Amino acid sequence: DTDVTVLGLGLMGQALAGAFLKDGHATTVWNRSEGKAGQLAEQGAVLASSARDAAEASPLVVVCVSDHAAVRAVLDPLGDVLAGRVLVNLTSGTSEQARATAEWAAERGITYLDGAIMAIPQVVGTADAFLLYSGPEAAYEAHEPTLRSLGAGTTYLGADHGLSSLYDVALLGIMWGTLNSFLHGAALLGTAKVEATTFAPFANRWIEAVTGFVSAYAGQVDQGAYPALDATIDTHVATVDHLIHESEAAGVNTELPRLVRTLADRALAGGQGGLGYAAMIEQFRSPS
Amino acid sequence: RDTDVTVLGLGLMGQALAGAFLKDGHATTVWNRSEGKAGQLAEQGAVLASSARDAAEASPLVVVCVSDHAAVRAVLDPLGDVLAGRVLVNLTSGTSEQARATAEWAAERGITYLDGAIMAIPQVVGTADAFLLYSGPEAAYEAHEPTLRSLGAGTTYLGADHGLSSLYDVALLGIMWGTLNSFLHGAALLGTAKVEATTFAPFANRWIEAVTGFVSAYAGQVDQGAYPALDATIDTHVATVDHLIHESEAAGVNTELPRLVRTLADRALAGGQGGLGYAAMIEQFRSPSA
Ligand SMILES: NC(=O)c1ccc[n+]([C@@H]2O[C@H](COP(=O)([O-])OP(=O)(O)OC[C@H]3O[C@@H](n4cnc5c(N)ncnc54)[C@H](OP(=O)(O)O)[C@@H]3O)[C@@H](O)[C@H]2O)c1
Ligand SMILES: NC(=O)c1ccc[n+]([C@@H]2O[C@H](COP(=O)([O-])OP(=O)(O)OC[C@H]3O[C@@H](n4cnc5c(N)ncnc54)[C@H](OP(=O)(O)O)[C@@H]3O)[C@@H](O)[C@H]2O)c1
Ligand SMILES: OC(O)(c1ccccc1)C(F)(F)F
Ligand SMILES: OC(O)(c1ccccc1)C(F)(F)F
Ligand SMILES: [Mg+2]
Ligand SMILES: [Mg+2]
């Protein structure tokens, strides 16, 4: 008998199991492919022979596989064994997928939490890891002390199982937006032989300033009123052109700032050049 | 009146620059092309010059913050003699080429010149969190840093090439648009589930702070040209990019951002780089689209 089971031992599942073990929890693990549990076994994990055996070992069963199709493949034969345990699904997917698994679980009397890991594997188990959970509040509250091994930023969103996925994809969008523009900046700076590691601390200090703009612009989005207290969209677009021109002169890719300019051009066509950047929200509300 | 610092250009940003100099006790002369922008500044003790030439003559340090390079040239071209013996600081946005052109103009005339970038909004200027970047002669930066620091404790020197400030500036501003656009898309998506943008924001900001750890790690990989998937493979990324596209389509919101993310990542996939870390995406930014 163990405290927690982890099903799926990819890069992330391995970190999940490792964090549970670091905090002293008796942990059972299983993976479809043999040979991914070596380090975990040395740390004290129990290697279950089968997914069914693994599920039977613990009152809390955590799944972290590639996608919804994998989740269904692992879970579909475990409907009997999972009854009366709490199943926690940390696999990425859509709100629709999460609601489908929630319906599957409810038909079978399995209490279900659907979560999103807002961390990389190396940050799991530390104070900086953040994780979001949706489903029954009482099940979250009953298992939170154990789930908190995965990160101090463990947080409950609400009863609708799909919420975790909705927040997750919205947040992941920000990751790509920030990383892609960082990489474009590094490519541009690399033409002047500025190393990416030289640029990074400037990028990160600036990103910290940008979080203040996020908070201010969020208030403006909630009002539907976008005064240019800092800078007008017209002022922004003049600098977008500088980025385009600088990139062209350096011979690097310009797809990112070209899309920025295209989207801002729609606001300008709507007469919003004199408003603050938060007015751009109107360009994201509907398809082009 | 003899003053410590002159500000030419009293837009939203110029007003904040002049205000910060005044807050720190510096005698400040101001000028703007259009009359009537300086009322609040005058009440704070700014001296309102009648002309740009009079303003430039009042101080040993002259700061310009106008719309663009064309405006800078319009203001400065007649001041080549007046600027003799003074240090000119240009905080106007522009390209590295424009900065080097103004630097050449200044050098022909013996005007010591610093080219800077304001990595802050007007309300943050004059606080400890404001970040500003300067390029040009190190000795001139060192001589005027105590006064320049009135604009922000994050005042920093980049190097001797005057164009560096602009190169860093546009690279950094790209990050601002990338982050803000994706935040606004996320807010639009969450709004369909009745989540307010102000509810989402603290989650976005906590996550953005985690992403800075990825920036630092990936930068090291960029400098090595080696991109092992220590966290997640590009294949794993693209599966979540599709979730974002599908979620956005189901919610009826715009999908242009994640579609471009997918397009760019598909180029890495076509090159066989699905099993590498996301830092390998640097190769998609090095050259024009084919
Ligand atoms: N890595 C990260 O930074 C990170 C961060 C946040 C969220 N996540 C999410 O966490 C999940 C796992 O990612 P990862 O990085 O651990 O991926 P990974 O290294 O690709 O692991 C995928 C896992 O899914 C299993 N799997 C795939 N298809 C299966 C099937 N048909 N039946 C049973 N098991 C199957 C794999 O088993 P085999 O070993 O047998 O192939 C493996 O355990 C993904 O949803 C991902 O988006 C990852
Ligand atoms: N606002 C921000 O958050 C921010 C942040 C960082 C950097 N910046 C940069 O700071 C600079 C100023 O931005 P801002 O927000 O202050 O813009 P702004 O409010 O639009 O001000 C533009 C300024 O330039 C002057 N100007 C324009 N053309 C001129 C010319 N031919 N001759 C003389 N003066 C001229 C204007 O004078 P009039 O009043 O007579 O038109 C005004 O003082 C821009 O390069 C901008 O990108 C701004
Ligand atoms: O790019 C900008 O619009 C900007 C806004 C906010 C903070 C820094 C820069 C500007 F054009 F004003 F520089
Ligand atoms: O979106 C992801 O690639 C990811 C990577 C790093 C941190 C969070 C999420 C994943 F697909 F893995 F979820
Ligand atoms: Mg070269
Ligand atoms: Mg090397």
XYZ file of C-alpha atoms and ligand atoms in Angstrom:
702
model
C 0.000 0.000 0.000
C 1.300 3.413 -0.987
C 0.187 7.031 -0.654
C 0.207 8.009 -4.343
C 0.490 6.319 -7.764
C 1.942 7.979 -10.874
C 0.878 6.577 -14.269
C 3.153 7.812 -17.044
C 6.898 8.225 -16.715
C 7.842 10.657 -19.443
C 10.052 13.634 -18.567
C 7.190 15.096 -16.571
C 5.827 11.959 -14.940
C 9.317 11.138 -13.719
C 9.564 14.597 -12.059
C 6.113 14.176 -10.492
C 7.063 10.810 -8.934
C 10.453 12.228 -7.856
C 8.767 15.099 -6.011
C 6.394 12.767 -4.188
C 9.346 10.610 -3.128
C 11.420 13.663 -1.999
C 8.644 14.610 0.399
C 8.572 11.164 1.976
C 5.393 9.817 0.295
C 5.204 6.091 -0.416
C 4.967 6.111 -4.194
C 4.056 3.464 -6.771
C 4.885 4.099 -10.464
C 4.020 2.532 -13.833
C 4.791 3.305 -17.480
C 3.718 1.562 -20.720
C 7.353 1.162 -21.806
C 9.719 -0.691 -19.418
C 13.036 0.971 -18.404
C 12.044 4.537 -17.492
C 11.776 3.861 -13.717
C 15.455 3.089 -12.949
C 16.305 6.274 -11.054
C 12.912 6.292 -9.350
C 13.321 2.723 -8.081
C 16.687 3.705 -6.599
C 14.905 6.584 -4.837
C 12.362 4.179 -3.339
C 9.502 4.023 -5.836
C 7.612 0.737 -6.083
C 7.578 -0.415 -9.765
C 4.139 -1.892 -10.384
C 3.829 -4.724 -12.920
C 0.778 -3.268 -14.639
C -1.312 -0.124 -14.654
C -4.087 -2.003 -12.850
C -1.727 -3.057 -10.030
C -0.439 0.539 -9.785
C -3.939 1.987 -9.558
C -4.903 -0.518 -6.853
C -1.950 0.478 -4.632
C -2.956 4.024 -3.671
C -5.965 6.164 -2.732
C -4.651 8.956 -5.036
C -3.784 8.150 -8.650
C -2.091 10.719 -10.872
C -1.897 10.330 -14.652
C 0.530 12.257 -16.852
C 0.726 10.854 -20.379
C 1.019 12.550 -23.797
C -2.613 13.420 -24.682
C -6.280 12.540 -24.259
C -6.045 9.486 -26.559
C -3.286 8.104 -24.314
C -5.336 8.902 -21.224
C -8.297 6.917 -22.603
C -6.001 4.013 -23.536
C -4.571 3.843 -19.982
C -7.776 4.510 -18.048
C -10.539 2.697 -20.048
C -9.750 -0.741 -18.510
C -9.298 0.663 -14.966
C -12.879 1.816 -14.372
C -13.522 -0.833 -11.731
C -10.267 -0.520 -9.841
C -10.476 3.317 -9.712
C -13.901 3.413 -8.043
C -13.489 4.974 -4.558
C -10.017 6.438 -5.377
C -9.289 9.982 -6.498
C -7.994 10.243 -10.006
C -5.933 13.339 -10.901
C -5.241 13.933 -14.598
C -2.308 16.257 -15.343
C -2.133 15.407 -19.055
C -2.430 18.453 -21.367
C -5.568 18.834 -23.470
C -8.671 20.891 -24.224
C -11.627 21.771 -22.009
C -13.766 19.433 -24.148
C -11.363 16.510 -23.457
C -11.378 17.236 -19.750
C -15.205 17.247 -19.635
C -15.262 13.946 -21.572
C -12.983 12.283 -18.992
C -15.036 13.819 -16.189
C -18.225 12.245 -17.642
C -16.425 8.855 -17.963
C -15.366 9.109 -14.339
C -18.766 10.176 -13.007
C -20.573 7.240 -14.752
C -18.166 4.918 -12.839
C -18.188 6.606 -9.441
C -14.553 7.810 -9.716
C -13.872 11.176 -8.080
C -11.924 13.227 -10.627
C -9.640 16.278 -10.593
C -8.371 17.703 -13.830
C -5.183 19.755 -13.528
C -2.510 21.612 -15.416
C 1.184 21.700 -14.551
C 2.468 25.238 -15.096
C 6.102 24.216 -14.699
C 8.902 22.354 -16.387
C 10.053 19.026 -14.860
C 13.092 20.529 -13.145
C 10.921 23.099 -11.309
C 8.325 20.536 -10.140
C 8.663 19.919 -6.416
C 9.952 23.464 -5.734
C 8.401 26.639 -4.417
C 8.205 28.129 -7.886
C 6.138 25.340 -9.459
C 2.528 26.183 -10.061
C -0.324 23.864 -10.715
C -4.048 24.444 -11.355
C -6.854 22.033 -10.424
C -10.560 21.850 -11.251
C -13.261 19.465 -10.056
C -14.832 18.828 -6.647
C -13.479 21.137 -4.014
C -13.738 18.537 -1.264
C -11.463 16.134 -3.188
C -8.922 18.906 -3.777
C -9.011 19.811 -0.044
C -8.640 16.131 1.000
C -5.516 15.557 -1.161
C -3.930 19.054 -1.230
C -1.346 18.259 1.453
C 0.038 15.468 -0.791
C -0.486 17.329 -4.086
C 1.472 20.263 -2.620
C 4.624 18.112 -2.973
C 4.507 19.029 -6.671
C 4.738 22.756 -5.956
C 3.862 25.421 -3.443
C 1.820 27.161 -6.133
C -0.834 24.450 -6.129
C -4.193 26.249 -6.591
C -7.891 25.334 -6.977
C -9.863 26.990 -9.783
C -13.421 25.730 -9.352
C -15.865 22.919 -9.958
C -15.988 22.903 -13.779
C -13.380 20.316 -14.810
C -12.669 22.110 -18.102
C -11.369 25.311 -16.415
C -7.852 23.978 -15.832
C -7.362 23.350 -19.566
C -8.768 26.729 -20.550
C -6.355 28.536 -18.205
C -3.529 26.241 -19.310
C -3.756 26.913 -23.053
C -4.205 30.661 -22.465
C -1.035 30.629 -20.320
C 0.925 28.466 -22.782
C 0.128 30.991 -25.522
C 1.991 33.577 -23.465
C 4.985 31.250 -23.200
C 5.252 30.942 -27.012
C 4.623 34.672 -27.533
C 7.408 35.553 -25.071
C 9.875 32.844 -26.158
C 9.463 33.459 -29.877
C 10.014 37.194 -29.493
C 13.001 36.557 -27.179
C 14.487 34.231 -29.847
C 13.873 36.789 -32.608
C 15.606 39.402 -30.443
C 18.533 37.076 -29.838
C 18.828 36.403 -33.597
C 18.815 40.150 -34.279
C 21.397 40.876 -31.590
C 23.541 37.923 -32.778
C 24.165 39.833 -36.061
C 26.109 42.305 -33.941
C 27.781 39.373 -32.112
C 25.871 39.937 -28.910
C 25.533 36.495 -27.256
C 22.103 35.287 -26.239
C 23.313 34.858 -22.648
C 24.352 38.553 -22.682
C 20.873 39.578 -23.874
C 18.908 37.311 -21.514
C 19.232 39.342 -18.285
C 18.070 42.475 -20.166
C 15.156 40.527 -21.645
C 14.187 39.197 -18.211
C 14.397 42.591 -16.504
C 12.195 44.016 -19.249
C 9.746 41.118 -19.018
C 9.374 41.987 -15.330
C 8.416 45.562 -16.320
C 5.918 44.160 -18.902
C 4.017 42.363 -16.106
C 3.047 45.827 -14.795
C 1.543 46.608 -18.224
C -0.349 43.304 -18.146
C -1.998 44.248 -14.786
C -2.905 47.812 -15.954
C -4.213 46.686 -19.358
C -6.278 43.936 -17.719
C -8.210 46.641 -15.837
C -8.779 48.523 -19.044
C -10.045 45.327 -20.726
C -12.550 44.882 -17.885
C -13.791 48.454 -18.348
C -13.839 48.375 -22.167
C -12.097 51.760 -22.027
C -8.536 52.197 -23.228
C -7.058 55.644 -22.528
C -3.404 56.061 -23.557
C -2.040 56.840 -20.118
C 1.406 55.556 -21.148
C 1.675 55.372 -24.940
C -0.749 55.506 -27.904
C -1.081 52.717 -30.468
C 0.283 55.235 -33.017
C 3.454 55.559 -30.908
C 3.685 51.754 -30.613
C 3.409 51.205 -34.380
C 6.235 53.634 -35.109
C 8.479 51.371 -32.949
C 7.082 48.196 -34.554
C 8.367 49.662 -37.833
C 11.790 50.244 -36.254
C 11.889 46.549 -35.319
C 10.878 45.550 -38.863
C 13.507 47.846 -40.405
C 16.226 46.769 -38.013
C 15.450 43.112 -38.738
C 15.487 43.687 -42.534
C 18.834 45.500 -42.335
C 20.274 42.614 -40.231
C 18.865 39.966 -42.643
C 16.845 38.116 -39.981
C 13.247 36.873 -39.971
C 10.461 39.478 -39.731
C 7.324 37.332 -39.386
C 6.681 38.243 -35.776
C 6.699 42.045 -35.991
C 4.895 41.863 -39.373
C 1.966 40.117 -37.652
C 2.156 42.689 -34.814
C 1.908 45.465 -37.430
C -0.960 43.708 -39.315
C -2.998 43.378 -36.155
C -2.307 46.945 -35.017
C -3.306 48.195 -38.541
C -6.818 46.896 -37.826
C -7.045 49.031 -34.707
C -5.768 52.015 -36.681
C -8.466 51.404 -39.338
C -11.033 51.470 -36.491
C -9.823 54.908 -35.368
C -8.006 53.626 -32.279
C -4.532 55.078 -32.975
C -4.939 57.486 -30.081
C -5.932 54.809 -27.568
C -3.673 52.680 -25.350
C -2.443 49.242 -26.395
C -5.139 47.511 -24.352
C -7.611 48.452 -27.132
C -5.934 45.609 -29.073
C -8.198 43.260 -27.109
C -10.851 43.983 -29.773
C -8.633 42.321 -32.413
C -8.552 39.024 -30.462
C -12.251 38.631 -29.712
C -13.253 37.204 -33.117
C -11.731 35.453 -36.128
C -10.004 37.781 -38.509
C 18.272 81.149 -15.817
C 21.230 78.629 -15.755
C 19.909 75.127 -15.152
C 21.322 71.623 -14.688
C 19.350 69.818 -17.403
C 17.234 70.688 -20.469
C 14.454 68.493 -21.858
C 13.439 69.042 -25.502
C 10.106 67.394 -26.283
C 7.156 67.368 -23.893
C 5.001 64.490 -25.037
C 3.755 61.891 -22.572
C 7.326 60.703 -22.093
C 9.142 64.040 -22.176
C 6.803 65.326 -19.498
C 7.731 62.378 -17.270
C 11.464 62.883 -17.915
C 11.276 66.591 -16.950
C 9.135 65.726 -13.916
C 11.695 63.184 -12.679
C 14.562 65.626 -13.013
C 12.526 68.182 -11.032
C 11.599 65.621 -8.314
C 15.266 64.970 -7.686
C 16.033 68.637 -7.224
C 17.667 69.371 -10.596
C 17.150 72.825 -12.092
C 15.315 72.002 -15.284
C 14.607 73.963 -18.465
C 11.963 72.624 -20.857
C 10.796 73.276 -24.430
C 8.238 71.774 -26.821
C 7.389 72.660 -30.445
C 3.760 73.275 -29.508
C 2.988 75.803 -26.726
C 0.713 74.752 -23.823
C 2.059 71.329 -22.795
C 4.232 72.692 -19.929
C 1.690 74.137 -17.459
C 2.057 71.439 -14.776
C 5.844 71.375 -15.234
C 6.038 75.153 -14.710
C 4.096 74.767 -11.462
C 6.693 72.178 -10.390
C 9.508 74.666 -11.099
C 10.536 73.985 -14.681
C 11.812 77.005 -16.614
C 9.794 77.324 -19.887
C 12.152 78.342 -22.698
C 10.672 80.270 -25.643
C 12.785 78.382 -28.186
C 14.747 75.167 -28.563
C 17.907 77.228 -28.963
C 17.284 79.099 -25.674
C 16.538 75.770 -23.951
C 19.726 74.166 -25.221
C 21.798 77.156 -24.100
C 20.527 76.924 -20.504
C 22.139 73.643 -19.424
C 25.285 71.506 -19.700
C 23.136 68.365 -20.270
C 20.475 68.387 -22.993
C 18.005 65.507 -23.288
C 15.824 65.080 -26.393
C 12.688 62.904 -26.464
C 10.617 63.525 -29.594
C 8.681 61.180 -31.894
C 11.347 59.850 -34.314
C 14.674 60.438 -36.025
C 13.192 62.923 -38.532
C 11.988 65.031 -35.590
C 15.335 64.705 -33.857
C 17.108 66.050 -36.974
C 14.572 68.898 -37.281
C 15.225 69.981 -33.651
C 18.992 69.455 -33.589
C 20.181 70.563 -37.068
C 20.229 74.301 -36.140
C 21.781 73.721 -32.692
C 25.235 72.478 -33.792
C 26.994 75.543 -32.447
C 24.885 76.037 -29.362
C 25.519 72.369 -28.300
C 29.286 73.006 -28.166
C 30.602 72.009 -24.743
C 27.305 70.309 -23.784
C 26.403 66.652 -23.528
C 23.515 65.664 -25.754
C 21.400 62.665 -24.695
C 18.914 61.284 -27.236
C 16.113 59.137 -25.816
C 13.989 59.170 -28.994
C 13.060 55.724 -30.440
C 14.752 54.621 -33.669
C 17.043 52.141 -35.423
C 20.748 51.497 -34.924
C 21.444 53.137 -38.289
C 19.636 56.335 -37.186
C 21.539 56.414 -33.901
C 24.881 56.098 -35.699
C 23.874 58.880 -38.128
C 23.142 61.284 -35.229
C 26.396 60.181 -33.588
C 28.330 61.103 -36.764
C 26.542 64.505 -36.906
C 27.524 65.137 -33.274
C 31.136 63.994 -33.685
C 31.731 66.291 -36.749
C 30.676 69.183 -34.424
C 32.504 68.144 -31.261
C 29.237 67.445 -29.358
C 29.575 64.648 -26.804
C 26.673 62.303 -27.470
C 24.894 59.510 -25.587
C 22.177 57.527 -27.294
C 19.677 55.896 -24.936
C 16.534 53.817 -24.767
C 13.784 54.246 -22.191
C 12.662 50.761 -21.159
C 9.795 52.123 -19.096
C 6.447 53.822 -19.307
C 6.074 57.488 -18.208
C 4.517 56.617 -14.859
C 7.514 54.406 -13.933
C 10.161 56.928 -15.003
C 11.757 58.476 -11.922
C 11.229 55.360 -9.782
C 13.598 52.627 -8.770
C 12.044 50.192 -11.221
C 12.667 52.251 -14.345
C 15.194 50.673 -16.697
C 17.163 52.797 -19.207
C 20.019 51.807 -21.541
C 22.807 54.113 -22.767
C 25.507 53.834 -25.389
C 28.359 56.101 -26.367
C 31.595 57.137 -24.635
C 31.929 55.502 -21.260
C 33.528 58.585 -19.728
C 30.504 60.733 -20.646
C 28.120 58.139 -19.197
C 30.193 58.045 -15.970
C 30.288 61.868 -15.751
C 26.484 62.256 -16.076
C 25.198 58.996 -14.485
C 24.354 60.683 -11.165
C 21.956 63.044 -12.965
C 20.708 60.425 -15.473
C 19.890 58.169 -12.495
C 17.026 60.539 -11.642
C 15.125 58.826 -14.459
C 15.585 55.376 -12.901
C 17.800 53.241 -10.743
C 17.972 50.747 -13.622
C 20.118 53.136 -15.619
C 22.755 50.961 -17.351
C 25.637 51.392 -19.820
C 25.814 49.085 -22.833
C 29.012 50.058 -24.610
C 30.702 52.467 -26.955
C 28.728 51.837 -30.136
C 25.884 54.374 -30.143
C 23.675 51.958 -32.129
C 23.563 49.319 -29.365
C 20.848 51.113 -27.428
C 18.481 50.930 -30.411
C 19.327 47.328 -31.236
C 18.573 46.267 -27.671
C 15.497 48.519 -27.594
C 13.742 47.062 -30.644
C 14.624 43.493 -29.575
C 13.109 44.191 -26.143
C 10.028 45.931 -27.556
C 9.393 42.835 -29.710
C 9.133 40.884 -26.457
C 6.636 43.395 -25.116
C 4.322 42.917 -28.154
C 4.774 39.123 -28.114
C 3.854 38.966 -24.408
C 1.044 41.540 -24.503
C -0.621 40.146 -27.640
C -0.646 36.619 -26.243
C -1.908 37.921 -22.884
C -4.760 39.737 -24.692
C -5.600 36.625 -26.737
C -5.676 34.657 -23.487
C -7.914 37.221 -21.861
C -10.288 37.067 -24.864
C -10.372 33.246 -24.614
C -10.982 33.292 -20.888
C -13.668 35.997 -21.270
C -15.800 33.416 -23.140
C -15.903 31.413 -19.910
C -16.814 34.582 -17.969
C -13.353 34.955 -16.433
C -12.444 38.671 -16.132
C -9.084 39.827 -17.458
C -8.198 41.075 -13.957
C -8.828 37.546 -12.631
C -6.515 36.072 -15.288
C -3.734 38.675 -14.905
C -2.111 37.405 -11.689
C -1.923 33.890 -13.213
C -0.427 35.331 -16.412
C 2.153 37.305 -14.418
C 3.191 34.389 -12.220
C 3.614 32.289 -15.363
C 5.557 35.009 -17.170
C 7.955 34.990 -14.218
C 8.475 31.216 -14.696
C 9.056 31.790 -18.447
C 12.071 34.006 -17.611
C 13.776 30.817 -16.304
C 13.217 29.241 -19.730
C 14.653 32.348 -21.408
C 17.911 32.007 -19.380
C 18.241 28.247 -20.058
C 17.434 28.555 -23.768
C 19.872 31.437 -24.148
C 22.684 29.117 -23.051
C 21.575 26.555 -25.607
C 21.509 29.255 -28.331
C 25.101 30.153 -27.485
C 26.145 26.486 -27.749
C 24.119 25.723 -30.894
C 22.971 22.584 -29.122
C 19.374 22.104 -28.101
C 18.685 18.984 -26.015
C 15.091 18.621 -24.790
C 15.805 18.769 -21.082
C 12.256 19.905 -20.304
C 10.007 19.316 -23.316
C 10.484 18.446 -26.983
C 9.204 20.610 -29.834
C 6.817 17.702 -30.623
C 5.367 18.012 -27.117
C 5.070 21.788 -27.552
C 3.219 21.516 -30.888
C 0.626 19.149 -29.393
C -0.259 21.947 -26.896
C -0.175 24.595 -29.629
C -2.941 22.551 -31.268
C -4.922 22.460 -28.030
C -4.747 26.292 -27.951
C -5.886 26.521 -31.586
C -8.775 24.087 -30.961
C -9.820 25.808 -27.757
C -9.750 29.198 -29.473
C -11.830 27.917 -32.443
C -14.410 26.387 -30.070
C -14.630 29.711 -28.140
C -14.941 31.732 -31.384
C -11.891 33.937 -30.721
C -9.042 35.010 -33.028
C -6.431 32.331 -33.805
C -3.777 34.282 -35.737
C -1.233 34.150 -32.899
C -1.135 30.419 -32.258
C -1.420 29.757 -36.013
C 1.850 31.662 -36.549
C 3.375 29.768 -33.565
C 2.354 26.486 -35.287
C 3.652 27.625 -38.702
C 7.050 28.504 -37.295
C 7.281 25.319 -35.263
C 6.285 23.277 -38.392
C 9.449 24.547 -40.078
C 11.505 22.983 -37.290
C 9.464 19.788 -37.620
C 10.106 19.712 -41.387
C 13.849 19.934 -40.569
C 13.604 16.870 -38.323
C 13.924 18.812 -35.047
C 10.822 17.565 -33.237
C 12.909 15.773 -30.659
C 14.930 18.864 -29.709
C 14.161 21.516 -27.101
C 12.346 24.732 -27.990
C 15.618 26.677 -28.164
C 16.220 25.053 -31.557
C 13.554 27.504 -32.798
C 16.307 30.113 -32.921
C 17.118 28.696 -36.387
C 13.699 29.905 -37.650
C 14.515 33.533 -36.699
C 17.962 33.816 -38.251
C 16.816 34.213 -41.883
C 13.948 35.606 -43.949
C 10.977 33.286 -44.655
C 11.414 31.190 -47.785
N 7.648 18.251 -20.168
C 7.153 19.428 -19.777
O 7.831 20.486 -19.628
C 5.673 19.538 -19.497
C 5.212 20.682 -18.840
C 3.822 20.831 -18.554
C 2.909 19.881 -19.013
N 3.418 18.775 -19.671
C 2.440 17.771 -20.188
O 2.567 16.509 -19.469
C 2.291 15.438 -20.405
C 3.493 14.579 -20.447
O 4.627 15.217 -21.098
P 6.073 14.626 -21.047
O 7.001 15.793 -21.202
O 6.218 13.720 -19.846
O 5.960 13.761 -22.406
P 6.880 12.561 -22.815
O 8.296 12.642 -22.308
O 6.608 12.499 -24.326
O 5.986 11.379 -22.066
C 4.774 10.976 -22.671
C 4.260 9.858 -21.756
O 3.005 9.434 -22.300
C 3.022 7.974 -22.415
N 2.138 7.545 -23.487
C 2.087 8.035 -24.735
N 1.164 7.339 -25.433
C 0.646 6.375 -24.614
C -0.336 5.297 -24.750
N -0.938 5.189 -25.929
N -0.550 4.469 -23.722
C 0.100 4.652 -22.556
N 1.053 5.616 -22.363
C 1.351 6.461 -23.360
C 4.474 7.646 -22.684
O 4.695 6.283 -22.486
P 5.971 5.557 -23.148
O 7.167 5.906 -22.309
O 5.543 4.153 -23.149
O 6.110 6.159 -24.507
C 5.115 8.582 -21.645
O 4.940 8.110 -20.308
C 1.968 16.089 -21.741
O 0.551 16.206 -21.794
C 2.574 17.500 -21.669
O 1.975 18.436 -22.608
C 4.721 18.631 -19.927
N 5.209 56.848 -24.061
C 5.971 55.850 -23.706
O 5.631 54.964 -22.892
C 7.326 55.688 -24.283
C 8.134 54.672 -23.747
C 9.422 54.535 -24.255
C 9.822 55.347 -25.302
N 9.017 56.252 -25.846
C 9.526 57.051 -26.943
O 9.630 58.364 -26.464
C 9.404 59.213 -27.668
C 8.280 60.182 -27.360
O 7.114 59.394 -27.104
P 5.845 60.104 -26.399
O 5.029 58.980 -25.904
O 6.333 61.294 -25.557
O 5.225 60.623 -27.829
P 4.225 61.838 -27.973
O 3.286 62.036 -26.784
O 3.467 61.565 -29.190
O 5.234 63.107 -28.184
C 5.871 63.304 -29.442
C 6.767 64.492 -29.188
O 7.620 64.749 -30.289
C 7.460 66.133 -30.692
N 7.687 66.275 -32.118
C 7.199 65.545 -33.125
N 7.646 65.973 -34.296
C 8.444 67.025 -34.026
C 9.248 67.944 -34.812
N 9.281 67.819 -36.195
N 9.868 68.963 -34.178
C 9.840 69.101 -32.834
N 9.145 68.276 -32.025
C 8.466 67.250 -32.597
C 6.073 66.518 -30.255
O 5.843 67.939 -30.224
P 4.339 68.496 -30.276
O 3.829 68.399 -28.876
O 4.598 69.852 -30.838
O 3.654 67.673 -31.369
C 6.011 65.823 -28.879
O 6.701 66.601 -27.874
C 9.069 58.337 -28.892
O 10.247 58.096 -29.683
C 8.601 57.051 -28.190
O 8.689 55.842 -28.961
C 7.828 56.487 -25.328
O 7.197 50.969 -28.022
C 6.557 51.929 -27.234
O 5.218 52.151 -27.567
C 6.717 51.669 -25.744
C 5.602 51.550 -24.926
C 5.738 51.193 -23.598
C 6.984 50.990 -23.058
C 8.092 51.123 -23.851
C 7.968 51.451 -25.194
C 7.174 53.238 -27.624
F 6.923 53.464 -28.912
F 6.577 54.162 -26.894
F 8.518 53.252 -27.388
O 3.457 23.357 -23.622
C 4.470 22.477 -23.204
O 5.431 22.175 -24.242
C 5.138 23.060 -21.961
C 6.512 23.207 -21.922
C 7.118 23.855 -20.854
C 6.364 24.328 -19.807
C 4.988 24.159 -19.824
C 4.380 23.536 -20.906
C 3.866 21.147 -22.862
F 3.376 20.569 -23.972
F 4.839 20.400 -22.367
F 2.888 21.257 -21.922
Mg 27.290 39.123 -40.252
Mg 30.297 26.635 -29.167
